[PDB]
Design an enzyme around this catalytic site. Structure first.
Site, PDB file in Angstrom:
ATOM      1  N   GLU B 421       0.840  -1.208   0.000  1.00  0.00           N
ATOM      2  CA  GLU B 421       0.000   0.000   0.000  1.00  0.00           C
ATOM      3  C   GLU B 421       0.875   1.259   0.000  1.00  0.00           C
ATOM      4  O   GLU B 421       0.854   2.060   0.933  1.00  0.00           O
ATOM      5  CB  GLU B 421      -1.026  -0.013   1.153  1.00  0.00           C
ATOM      6  CG  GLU B 421      -0.455  -0.060   2.566  1.00  0.00           C
ATOM      7  CD  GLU B 421      -1.508   0.066   3.660  1.00  0.00           C
ATOM      8  OE1 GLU B 421      -1.311  -0.546   4.733  1.00  0.00           O
ATOM      9  OE2 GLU B 421      -2.520   0.780   3.465  1.00  0.00           O
ATOM     10  N   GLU B 430       4.117   8.580  -4.000  1.00  0.00           N
ATOM     11  CA  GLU B 430       5.024   8.007  -2.985  1.00  0.00           C
ATOM     12  C   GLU B 430       6.084   7.077  -3.588  1.00  0.00           C
ATOM     13  O   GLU B 430       6.840   6.437  -2.854  1.00  0.00           O
ATOM     14  CB  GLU B 430       4.214   7.289  -1.912  1.00  0.00           C
ATOM     15  CG  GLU B 430       3.144   8.186  -1.320  1.00  0.00           C
ATOM     16  CD  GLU B 430       2.470   7.616  -0.100  1.00  0.00           C
ATOM     17  OE1 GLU B 430       2.634   6.414   0.188  1.00  0.00           O
ATOM     18  OE2 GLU B 430       1.770   8.394   0.573  1.00  0.00           O
TER      19      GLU B 430
HETATM   20  C1  LIG Z   1       1.326   2.099   4.831  1.00  0.00           C
HETATM   21  S1  LIG Z   1       2.509   3.278   4.301  1.00  0.00           S
HETATM   22  C2  LIG Z   1       3.544   2.264   3.305  1.00  0.00           C
HETATM   23  C3  LIG Z   1       4.719   1.740   4.109  1.00  0.00           C
HETATM   24  O1  LIG Z   1       5.717   1.412   3.144  1.00  0.00           O
HETATM   25  C4  LIG Z   1       7.030   1.561   3.646  1.00  0.00           C
HETATM   26  N1  LIG Z   1       7.942   1.671   2.506  1.00  0.00           N
HETATM   27  C5  LIG Z   1       7.938   2.623   1.563  1.00  0.00           C
HETATM   28  N2  LIG Z   1       8.921   2.404   0.664  1.00  0.00           N
HETATM   29  C6  LIG Z   1       9.560   1.291   1.038  1.00  0.00           C
HETATM   30  C7  LIG Z   1      10.691   0.496   0.535  1.00  0.00           C
HETATM   31  N3  LIG Z   1      11.347   0.867  -0.582  1.00  0.00           N
HETATM   32  N4  LIG Z   1      11.040  -0.617   1.225  1.00  0.00           N
HETATM   33  C8  LIG Z   1      10.391  -1.006   2.343  1.00  0.00           C
HETATM   34  N5  LIG Z   1       9.352  -0.324   2.855  1.00  0.00           N
HETATM   35  C9  LIG Z   1       8.905   0.806   2.253  1.00  0.00           C
HETATM   36  C10 LIG Z   1       6.922   2.827   4.435  1.00  0.00           C
HETATM   37  O2  LIG Z   1       7.867   2.851   5.504  1.00  0.00           O
HETATM   38  C11 LIG Z   1       5.504   2.754   4.945  1.00  0.00           C
HETATM   39  O3  LIG Z   1       5.505   2.272   6.288  1.00  0.00           O
HETATM   40  C1  LIG Z   2      -2.968   4.532   4.020  1.00  0.00           C
HETATM   41  C2  LIG Z   2      -1.957   5.323   3.231  1.00  0.00           C
HETATM   42  C3  LIG Z   2      -0.880   4.671   2.697  1.00  0.00           C
HETATM   43  C4  LIG Z   2       0.078   5.382   1.954  1.00  0.00           C
HETATM   44  N1  LIG Z   2       1.158   4.689   1.428  1.00  0.00           N
HETATM   45  N2  LIG Z   2      -0.047   6.686   1.756  1.00  0.00           N
HETATM   46  C5  LIG Z   2      -1.079   7.388   2.251  1.00  0.00           C
HETATM   47  C6  LIG Z   2      -1.200   8.785   2.032  1.00  0.00           C
HETATM   48  C7  LIG Z   2      -2.280   9.443   2.567  1.00  0.00           C
HETATM   49  C8  LIG Z   2      -3.229   8.730   3.307  1.00  0.00           C
HETATM   50  N3  LIG Z   2      -3.117   7.432   3.508  1.00  0.00           N
HETATM   51  C9  LIG Z   2      -2.087   6.723   3.016  1.00  0.00           C
END
Ligand SMILES: CSC[C@H]1O[C@@H](n2cnc3c(N)ncnc32)[C@H](O)[C@@H]1O
Ligand SMILES: Cc1cc(N)nc2cccnc12
Ligand SMILES: [Cl-]
Ligand SMILES: [Cl-]
Ligand SMILES: [Cl-]
Lengths: 299, 623
Positions: B421, B430
């Protein structure tokens, strides 16, 4: 006890007694008043008056309604009818009807004497029935504040109006479309019908011009330096025209609008003028300097 | 409860007037600070030398009353765009005097009319008051839905009211306002007090004011219909407008004399409409507070999210039952019933946080009657503490926690399913595309990725409010227009959607492709049917978790009760006039170097903007 600094209206009735309307346009309390003076030379002194009363709000305009009736245009949004009692000492309220939505600025009684018209800052014009104490008709013709309304002297269904929308409307309530627009320019500020000639009126504008107008079919003079506030013809057979202003001046004028008399005795805005029915050369004025000046016009 | 004031033009005793008004139930009073008819002269003698006092004493009320209860009004005779030079000069002095007196008193707001086209000199003098002294007073521009000229009775014989629809003409009062606030440089202190008339205009005229900073709505007593019993009411069409204004939480002013009963009745009606509306739904209850509040979009890759940020994510169990179901459906399509005991599937939550998806995977396996092996890959080491405490206490050897970056992690074995996610309000904001590309090597050749696909959507908007909020984010020690070259997460509220959302960028996982390139360039053409002002582009997204299972914040296809995600906003620097029938053509690039990823954008029609955020100068997303 005290009469309010700002004198707005002054009108002689048939016998020669003087009606004074006034309001407080500053200080703690913004209210109005109505005052009858049986000795005109005694005005403005409050102690030497025949009758007096306090209204709850200011007094933008008024007029006589016959011999003992005083129709008033207040800030409250009400048109008020006050009458004198059977011995002319008290001033009692007959009605006070809140029907306009803003300051009632202008008022005039129709030829019959049983109806009148009013103009307000709410932009509406209303014809009143004074016996039934109700509005017969309400017209939203204008697009801005109603500055002045003037009843036709002789035709009960006719009147003039003027406004901050630049329009002068010649009314005739016998039509399904009563209002009619009239050309010559700066905003119209004051209105006066010619008393002898049914087809003629004069208007003063905000630039200090007074201009002569025939309903069918245009002379004009630059009289004052500032807005023409009021226009009252004299009671002569060949009547002279008294013109007021916000320049704190008064001029009486002839048929062709040339200058005969000039008066700078007034130190604040000249709000009304009214000719004596007994002595036609004597003209009476009022203003915000609290002065009741009596001029001898060289006729 | 509705905040509601009384508008008067006649105050004899400010003491009594207030007490009467307060006993009626009005929060405040709009009134004149000088006498409406007390015209003044500032140049010509003798009138200029008029003995004072010029108005009432400030001592007549308490400071607290002046600060909370009184709203000043400009004197009706003050006309600084008069054709007469003398009236113009007097009005300038009169206006400053009145406004300076309102400032001296500490009034919360001051009313001014917009009742003609040319209010240029009014705007000038007001702008000067604003750059003279230091005061917090609001300014409420009294402007009607429809000008008095356009609603006048059709009773002038030789000047009849045209019975032809004039589309742009009927919107002229908006242009009165637009030119005033444009002239005053979009001051936050200049708001609208929208005046309503007895007959409403066409919807496009009302809709024109969507996005505008409406701080009040003026209701003349005359617009109220009378009913059988005798109370004031409004027509069903007026109510619709009231409910729309109630969402904007405007202050309701009641103008004019009592034509009806009490005055409380006019007020009581507004209360009755306010009590009886559709209640605040579960999305809108959560969002109360955040209406048009700008926030930086989260970057959980570059940053380490806080414990509460994760807690917020977890308050949306709808989302995780959608994740549960998608995983559940996938297990059945991979593991046939006869193989269920023999065949253990390798699931890998990539970016697990505090393990809500870990639990959703355990539960999906339980409901599917199939066996799984879990891996919980989390980059954040603070969140790993949460996992490892869940993992010691409950999960046991079934879950293996892996404190590593998914792109760095040398896997012991390939995955049947990669769950994740990593989606922002713009889906790919992201950097999920880049993350899962690095994780792709440890997917089996036949492996699923949940989500399988995600697409970002875009729609042009009009909010002069949100334009102003972005404009206020100018900061020290950076480009003075940087604030316009960066996205904002915001619960868009007072705004106007100018065209239906169209899709922008799309990614699929696994990316079965030779030369994987995640950069993009998309051109969109938005058909616009209204006259409006473009200030930015709302961003939404949609994702396919597995098959028919979806998540969406796209308004028209929005997933039910999913308050976690708010829309994103790409502002522009200079607002663009868009006529009815014209096409808004926007360009969007997705860009990247080895170290950072970013969006660039530009409007190309009906006029060209500059390219926004070139080379990620003002905004980047950290790889
Ligand atoms: C629920 S938010 C998604 C989660 O993904 C983790 N995340 C994002 N990018 C990476 C990555 N490249 N490797 C491992 N975890 C990640 C972030 O720390 C966050 O907790
Ligand atoms: C639940 C959630 C996951 C993510 N990776 N990004 C977000 C950004 C805004 C709100 N919720 C989020
Ligand atoms: Cl106002
Ligand atoms: Cl921010
Ligand atoms: Cl860079």
């Amino acid at each position: 006890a005290c009469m309010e600094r700002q004198l707005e209206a002054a009108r002689y009735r048939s016998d020669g007694a003087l009606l004074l309307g006034a309001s407080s346009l500053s200080g703690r309390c913004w209210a109005g008043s109505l005052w009858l003076f049986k000795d005109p030379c005694a005005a403005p002194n409050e102690g030497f008056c025949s009758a007096g009363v306090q209204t709850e709000a200011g007094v933008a305009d008024l007029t006589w309604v016959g011999e003992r009736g005083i129709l008033v245009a207040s800030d409250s949004g009400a048109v008020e009818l006050w009458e004198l009692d059977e011995n002319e000492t008290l001033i009692v309220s007959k009605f006070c009807k809140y029907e306009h939505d803003d300051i009632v600025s202008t008022v005039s009684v129709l030829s019959s004497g049983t109806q009148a018209v009013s103009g307000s800052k709410d932009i509406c014009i209303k014809v009143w029935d004074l016996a039934q104490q109700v509005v017969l008709s309400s017209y939203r013709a204008h697009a801005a504040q109603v500055t002045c309304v003037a009843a036709s002297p002789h035709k009960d269904s006719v009147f003039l109006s003027c406004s901050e929308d630049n329009r002068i409307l010649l009314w005739d309530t016998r039509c399904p479309k009563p209002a009619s627009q009239i050309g010559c320019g700066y905003l119209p500020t004051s209105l006066a019908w010619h008393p002898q000639q049914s087809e003629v009126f004069v208007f003063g504008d905000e630039n200090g011009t007074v201009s002569l107008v025939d309903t069918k079919s245009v002379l004009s003079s630059a009289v004052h330096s500032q807005c023409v506030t009021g226009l009252v013809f004299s009671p002569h057979s060949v009547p002279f025209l008294a013109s007021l202003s916000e320049d704190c001046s008064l001029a009486v004028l002839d048929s062709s609008l040339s200058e005969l008399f000039r008066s700078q005795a007034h130190r604040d805005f000249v709000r009304d003028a009214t000719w004596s029915p007994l002595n036609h050369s004597l003209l009476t004025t009022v203003g915000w300097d609290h002065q009741v000046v009596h001029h001898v016009v060289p006729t | 409860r509705v905040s509601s004031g009384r508008d008067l033009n006649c105050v004899p005793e400010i003491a009594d007037t207030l007490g009467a008004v307060a006993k009626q139930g009005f929060d405040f009073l709009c009134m004149p600070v000088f006498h409406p008819r007390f015209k003044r002269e500032f140049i010509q003698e003798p009138a200029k030398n008029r003995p004072g006092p010029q108005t009432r004493s400030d001592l007549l009320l308490s400071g607290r009353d002046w600060n909370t209860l009184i709203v000043g009004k400009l004197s009706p005779w003050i006309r600084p765009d008069s054709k007469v030079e003398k009236i113009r000069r007097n009005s300038e002095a009169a206006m400053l005097q009145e406004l300076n007196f309102g400032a001296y008193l500490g009034l919360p707001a001051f009313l001014l009319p917009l009742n003609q086209e040319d209010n240029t000199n009014l705007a000038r003098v007001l702008t000067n008051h604003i750059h003279t002294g230091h005061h917090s007073s609001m300014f409420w521009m009294r402007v009607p839905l429809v000008a008095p000229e356009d609603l006048r009775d059709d009773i002038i014989e030789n000047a009849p009211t045209t019975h032809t629809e004039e589309y742009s003409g009927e919107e002229k009062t908006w242009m009165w306002w637009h030119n005033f606030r444009t002239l005053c440089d979009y001051s936050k202190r200049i708001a609208v007090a929208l005046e309503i008339g007895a007959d409403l205009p066409s919807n496009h005229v009302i809709d024109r004011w969507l996005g505008e900073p409406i701080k009040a709505a003026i209701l003349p007593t005359s617009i109220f219909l009378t009913n059988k019993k005798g109370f004031p009411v409004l027509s069903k069409m007026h109510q619709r407008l009231i409910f729309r204004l109630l969402k904007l939480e405007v202050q309701f002013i009641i103008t004019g004399t009592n034509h009806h009963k009490e005055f409380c009745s006019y007020l009581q009606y507004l209360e009755y409409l306010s009590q009886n509306r559709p209640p605040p739904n579960a999305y809108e209850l959560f969002a109360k507070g955040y209406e048009d509040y700008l926030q930086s979009p989260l970057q959980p890759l570059m940053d380490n999210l806080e414990s509460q940020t994760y807690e917020v994510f977890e308050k949306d169990p709808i989302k995780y039952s959608q994740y549960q179901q998608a995983i559940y459906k996938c297990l059945l399509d991979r593991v046939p019933e006869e193989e269920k005991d023999t065949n253990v599937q390798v699931l890998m939550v990539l970016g697990a946080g505090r393990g809500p998806l870990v639990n959703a995977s355990l539960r999906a396996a339980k409901q599917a009657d199939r066996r799984i092996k879990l891996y919980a890959v989390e980059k954040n080491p603070n969140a790993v503490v949460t996992l490892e405490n869940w993992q010691f206490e409950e999960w046991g050897s079934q879950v293996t926690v892996v404190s590593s970056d998914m792109r760095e992690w040398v896997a012991p074995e390939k995955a049947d399913i990669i769950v994740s996610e990593l989606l922002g309000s713009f889906a790919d904001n992201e950097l999920s595309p880049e993350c899962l590309d690095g994780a792709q090597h440890f997917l089996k050749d036949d492996g699923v990725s949940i989500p399988g696909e995600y697409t970002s959507f875009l729609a042009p908007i009009s909010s002069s409010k949100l334009y102003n909020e972005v404009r206020a984010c100018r900061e020290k020690d950076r480009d003075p227009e940087a604030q316009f070259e960066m996205p904002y997460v915001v619960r868009l509220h007072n705004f106007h959607q100018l065209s239906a959302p169209q899709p922008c960028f799309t990614f699929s996982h696994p990316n079965r492709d030779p030369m994987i390139d995640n950069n993009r360039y998309c051109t969109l053409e938005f058909p616009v049917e209204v006259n409006t002002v473009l200030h930015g582009f709302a961003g939404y997204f949609e994702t396919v978790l597995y098959q028919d299972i979806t998540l969406s914040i796209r308004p028209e296809t929005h997933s039910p009760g999913m308050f976690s995600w708010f829309p994103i906003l790409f502002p522009i620097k200079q607002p663009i006039t868009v006529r009815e029938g014209q096409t808004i053509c926007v360009r969007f690039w997705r860009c990247s170097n080895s170290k950072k990823v970013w969006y660039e954008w530009a409007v190309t029609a009906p006029v060209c903007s500059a390219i926004h955020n070139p080379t990620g100068r003002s905004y980047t997303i950290g790889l």
